[PDB]
Structure 1
Amino acid sequence: KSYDYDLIIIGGGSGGLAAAKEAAQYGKKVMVLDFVTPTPLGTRWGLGGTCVNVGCIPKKLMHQAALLGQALQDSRNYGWKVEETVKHDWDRMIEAVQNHIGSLNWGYRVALREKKVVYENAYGQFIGPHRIKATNNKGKEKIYSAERFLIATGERPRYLGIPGDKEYCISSDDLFSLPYCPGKTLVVGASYVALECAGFLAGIGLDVTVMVRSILLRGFDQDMANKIGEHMEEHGIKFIRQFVPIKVEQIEAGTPGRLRVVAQSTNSEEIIEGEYNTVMLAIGRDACTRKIGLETVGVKINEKTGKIPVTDEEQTNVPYIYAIGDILEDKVELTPVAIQAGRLLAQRLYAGSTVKCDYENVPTTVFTPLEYGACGLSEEKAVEKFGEENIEVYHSYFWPLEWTIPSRDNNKCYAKIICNTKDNERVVGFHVLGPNAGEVTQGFAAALKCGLTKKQLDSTIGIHPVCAEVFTTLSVTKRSGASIL
């Protein structure tokens, strides 16, 4: 019957925009609702969502700034006449990053206008079957109807339920647009975002302290996680183990001001205090699925975690509403997963395709000071799945050539592959800790999709001299116990 649009995408993040562009490619009427509720402090950003504005992109750019710091240090030994110590200007770096983010926001808006996709800067909210309520910034309300709906609502940073967090602490949301140098900083948490931000804040010369609850990088391989922790610690970052903040109180306002954080042990009553210029909370992310009125349409969600269960076709229990992105239950919360799922969903709905999104063996990279690229099973998970006796772990240290002249950081980089003997020594796991990890990891992920075997990998000819070539000649097993130095 009557239907304003054929597809309404709530949320203009990576996945949402990808699906919008693709569905528009097939002449369907599509409308995108994107609205960023401001941070407790008041920070807001444009179209594009978390990756573009507050995520993947600026984090990579600041990591590049840190890497260029290390390059400035390295250049001395290679013959460049650079002054011994170079200072870093936070304001300029922020200006450059924010300028590029603005350019990407504008690019996306132009792309949406070009593909004839209506963009409405309004907060979406279900009120009834096939109908939604959109509230603009000013407060004006409008109603829309659609045949199909795409929930692409994404997540927002989580806060500790402690006093002072919301008015005195900053999150990933605020850091990449912070209008002043954070000075000394306390990063709470051990998620990959926590280590990324800690690392590159340390690289630009600030004093950073990371406060962890139990373990580093839950979900990632713990051996590699421990190695990253060791390397970060040897670079000047300080770690306080087994502590959670219980109160944050402002000593003096400013830009930055001074704050006191009082925290309690996890296994005792021992209480320690510290003074920091700003405190960044990186302790996970919460789905924004509570406040979109899913009850008015009957979408079933996991009340405990907020995630929405979906079929292998991204379909909810309600036939005409589909969800993509991080909000999904037991999927992988990465931007290329969202984009691929959106593209394939659009092609399935309007292009007669049958290809589904494969969520298995998807690579990731943690951009710590020492990049960490991973694809496939962890060692622990592999042993769980196939049995200790059936898993052989080939590993080796290697020394990237570019670091020999600076004469630094030997026998730190680490490469290990986890192979299943029961299945022709198939390579079920791949982990690399070293420079340009993601570039090396992309190819071996594509190989894992092809069922790379240890024999073929051994037959592949390395390139010389390139870091990645360490993966050509892995011959030492952990089971053998031989040294790898």
Structure 2
Amino acid sequence: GTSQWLRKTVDSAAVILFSKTTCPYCKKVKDVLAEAKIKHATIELDQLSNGSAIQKCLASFSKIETVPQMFVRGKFIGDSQTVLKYYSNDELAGIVNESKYDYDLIVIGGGSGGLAAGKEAAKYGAKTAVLDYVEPTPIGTTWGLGGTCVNVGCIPKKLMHQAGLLSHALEDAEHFGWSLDRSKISHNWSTMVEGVQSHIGSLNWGYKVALRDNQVTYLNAKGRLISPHEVQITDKNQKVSTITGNKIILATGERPKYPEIPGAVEYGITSDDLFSLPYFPGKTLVIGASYVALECAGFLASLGGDVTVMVRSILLRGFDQQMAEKVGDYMENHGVKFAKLCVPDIKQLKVVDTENNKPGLLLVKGHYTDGKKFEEEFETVIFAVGREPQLSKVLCETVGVKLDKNGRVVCTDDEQTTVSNVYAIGDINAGKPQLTPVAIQAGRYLARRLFAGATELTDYSNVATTVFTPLEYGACGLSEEDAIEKYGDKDIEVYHSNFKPLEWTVAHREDNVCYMKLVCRKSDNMRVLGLHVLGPNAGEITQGYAVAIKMGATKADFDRTIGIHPTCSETFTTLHVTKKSGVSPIV
């Protein structure tokens, strides 16, 4: 119990001090360590409810039972007299840098999860390397340190969403008394992209500064795991070499898929290319119906573009389908065209005009599921048909790391792979939600367990989401159809209501488009199984409720909490119309 924890903690910690807050000999050792600039984990036994047992177990390692005790990479170094001995004899620095491997930790992948893991590990004295390389897109697009979210994901996507939201702010301003004329105003794409990219550039720089300031080695090189402890690296001159590490974290993420049709790779683009594109896409086809497809089509339409979305089967597969349909109906009422039940079978009519900064022109041919034909011209074609890893590029098959049928890494609930010193975090961890805050939490918590004796695991259940379509959609927990499948229709009650933002009244916007519902379990005290909201600032609205759902909130907890007025979120505190009653949810 305690003894198995202590043995795991001593074996993998890089530099660790066992201590008590009240001991002057411990304080004496602490003072020497960072005077020598030695980072290390510390465990204060007088703060743990079974530190008495832990203190006894230490003797199995050191032959002594007192504090302080200092260890390095699994070996007892000494008590207070001995550490100080090594200090004044100039032997300490070499003791703490002695290692079987080049690094205590090698992280393959410099994105959301890998940067978080690497920085946290270095805080506790682990000698750490972070490797990052960006394979160019088929047209040559590349970018800096930070991963998919920072460069070609959450950050530029929401900034362009905000640019689209501002179009309605300009419209609304007239009704609130401002003198501008919305009809005489236009949008400049390249001015937007320049501002977005300047912010991304400050993030690239900020990450390189942060790794420097934590004493992390950053290598802009491609990594490949060739045995449990050996990582082969290839740098920008094609020089190949091998570095070794005790623990390995795989954190290499995914890249967009292309469909296997003529012309797709040659003449289309993906989200990887869109966020730094030097010309306005113009008339655009988006192929796909994921949240990436709908978000990109949405802001393009708000920025003045002529936009079509070609949908294989349904919108937002895997999300609540009543909410998916309301999301799409709103988009279709504000500009976006949909080619439903349709797939592509791409021809080039004009080459991209790199000089004058203009798109080319394309003929797209496809068919509907009944066999009728699709044929139309577009200036830009964007594929948003899913994302995949390519771990046969990162991971030799002889190492023994097990993958699933989709090519993701099969892990235990502490992120361990089938190779005992190798872990995986982020989008490549099979079965986990593919989100930046999850990858960050998993990375930081894993670093603390490896190098500071922590025990807390990452909790992957009921993680809230937000889809940033022109009208935003936040959710936490089960869809209504999943809840019914799991418990049966008679054990599920659904409370719901339309609402109108107060900001929308003077602006003459729609009365009954925003919507929210709570999906509850009758036989478990009306437990809230899932929460759904369509409306402005849906992410801000949803976040706080995710804490209450984590704690097991019921309908009664929502009723006894009082609202804040005037807000959209307060509508969750007075819900009363049930779906079974058949009463209308309009307001």
Q: Is TM > 0.5 for Structure 1 vs Structure 2?
A: yes
For the pair 1:355 / 2:456, whether they are aligned, the reply is yes
Correspondences of 1:75-114 after superposition (within 5 Å): 75-85=173-183, 86-114=185-213
Moved over 3 A (4+): none
Question: What residue is the counterpart of 2:297 in the other structure?
Answer: 198
Q: Which residue of 2 aligns with 1:13?
A: 111
Rounded to whole Å, the distance in 2 between the matches of 1:296 and 1:81 is 70
Q: How does 1:311-460 map to 2 (within 5 A)?
A: 311-460=412-561
Contact 1:154 1:287 in 2 (8 A): yes
- Cα-to-partner distance string for 1:11-67 (whole Å, 9 max, x where unaligned): 001000000010011011010110000000100000000000000000010000011
> Residue 481 of structure 1 aligns with which residue?
582
Cα distance in structure 2, aligned partners of 1:47 and 1:192 = 24
Does residue 41 of structure 2 align to residue 41 of structure 1?
Answer: no
Whether 1:280 and 2:379 are equivalent positions in the alignment is no
Residue by residue over 1:416-466, the C-alpha shift from the partner in whole angstroms, topping out at 9 and shown as x without a partner, is 011111111011100010000000100011110111111111011000000
* C-alpha RMSD over aligned residues: 0.9
AA partner of residue 176 (structure 1): F
Secondary structure of 1:417's partner?
strand
How far does residue 296 in structure 1 lie from its aligned partner after superposition? 3.1
1:82-118 per-position Cα deviation (integer Å, ceiling 9, x unaligned) = 1232100000000000000000000011001000000
Q: What secondary structure does 1:76 align onto?
A: helix
Maintained 8 Å contact 1:130/1:145: yes
Paired with 2:208 and 2:102, the residues of 1 have a C-alpha distance of 21
CA–CA separation in structure 2 for the residues paired with 1:396 and 1:223: 13
What is the rounded CA distance, in whole Å, between the counterparts of 2:485 and 2:296 in structure 1?
Answer: 32
2:450 alignment partner, SS class: helix
Letter aligned with residue 227 of structure 1? K
**Deviation of residue 162 (structure 1)?**
0.6
Secondary structure in 1 aligned to 2:182? coil
**Structure 1 residue identity aligned to 2:221:** A
Secondary structure of 1:397 counterpart: strand
Quick one: which of 274, 284, 307 aligns to 2:408? Answer: 307
Kept in 1, the 8 Å contact 2:228–2:422? The answer is no
Contact 2:466-2:473 at 8 Å conserved across structures:
yes
- The superposition leaves residues 122-149 of structure 1 with CA deviations (integer Å, 9 ceiling, x where unpaired) of 0011222310111112211121101110
Matching residue of 1:71: 169
Matched, 1:174 2:273: yes
Q: Which residue of 2 aligns with 1:137?
A: 236
- Report which of the two structures shows the higher radius of gyration computed on alpha carbons: 2
Q: How far has the Cα of 1:200 moved from its partner?
A: 0.5
| Gaps in structure 1 of 5+ consecutive residues | none
Q: Does 1:160 align with 2:263?
A: no
**Residues 370 and 435, structure 1, Cα contact 8 Å, conserved in 2:** yes
Q: Which residue does the alignment assign to 1:291?
A: 393
1:192 Cα offset (Å): 0.3
Q: Which residue of 2 aligns with 1:187?
A: 286
Contact 2:258 2:265 in 1 (8 A): yes
- Indicate if the aligned counterparts of 1:129 and 1:296 stay in contact, CA closer than 8 A: no
Q: How far is the alpha carbon of 1:353 from its aligned partner?
A: 1.1
Shift of 1:240: 0.3
Q: Quick one: distance in 2 between partners of 1:192 and 1:308?
A: 24
Higher relative contact order (CA 8 A, sep 6+): 1
Over the matched positions of the two proteins, sequence identity in percent amounts to 61
CA contact (8 A) 1:153 1:288 kept: no
- Count of residue pairs the alignment pairs up: 482
Deviation string for 1:380-407 (max 9, x for gaps)? 1111112111110100000000011111
Unaligned stretches of 5+ residues in structure 2 = 1-98, 353-357
Between Structure 1 and Structure 2, which shows a larger proportion of helix residues? Answer: 2
CA shift at 1:294, angstroms? 3.4
Q: Report the counterpart of residue 364 of structure 2 in structure 1.
A: 261
Counterpart of 1:264, as a letter, is H
Q: Is the 8 A contact 2:170 2:182 kept in 1?
A: no
Opposite residue 238 of structure 2, the aligned amino acid is G
CA distance in 2, matches of 1:365, 1:126: 35
Corresponding letter in the other structure for 1:156: R
Q: How far off its partner does 1:268 sit?
A: 2.9
Query: How far apart in 1 are the matches of 2:114 and 2:182?
Result: 48
